[PDB]
């Protein structure tokens, strides 16, 4: 049978680098003037505590949830030649931004053309994936609220990218880049220089 999901799994070193950057962002954003004004638009605050649910091991960037072939389009994805050829191969993922919402905290991944070939295109695509290019959903989950599932992180990103498509000015300056307030508890850090993490494409089993 198929794996739980296919994706890029960061090396232990790359995972640690991205994770430590994630927590620093939560600490910074939480201490920031701009954030403390819109708390009512966020909570009815230590964000590291708020996003208590975090990946226990190495971080990953999912491509296709298969659920052992229970998910729609799972078989059609795994039978691809590019998926078989890329299985076990090493890749580099570009991290363009770190973001936060009342539900999730994650990192936006900007996929290369090669890596975009490993991105699925099934019949079911959520509303927020409308006028945006494929792979825009690509991300690494850094944390979630207590009653939120990791899958939500992708939806949060697509919702965020829809906002920026309309454009915005930054409300602050973090050491790694400019901070943008997108309203309704959403925040994005546009990194001055994009982070590169090393990862391996493969399948995860429960």
Residue numbers in the entry: 164 to 207, 215 to 337, 340 to 378
Lines from the paper:
While recognizing the caveat that the high KM for these mutants makes kcat rather inaccurate, this implies that the π-π stacking between Phe235 and the nucleotide base is not only required for substrate affinity, but it also may define correct substrate docking into a productive binding mode. In the F235L structure, the flexible active site β5-α7 loop (amino acids 319 – 321) is in the closed conformation. This loop is often found in a mixed conformation, and its conformation depends on the reaction step. As the active site of dCNPcat is empty in the crystal structure, we determined an additional structure of CNPcat with no ligand bound; this was successful when using the F235L mutant. All earlier structures have included either nucleotides or buffer components. The positions of the active-site water molecules, as well as side chain conformations of catalytic residues were nearly identical in dCNPcat and F235L, suggesting any changes in activity of dCNPcat are related to the replacement of H by D in the protein, solvent, and exchangeable sites of the substrate. Our observations allow us to speculate on active-site dynamics that take place during and after catalysis: The β5-α7 loop in both dCNPcat and F235L is closed, confirming the closed state of the active site in the apo form.
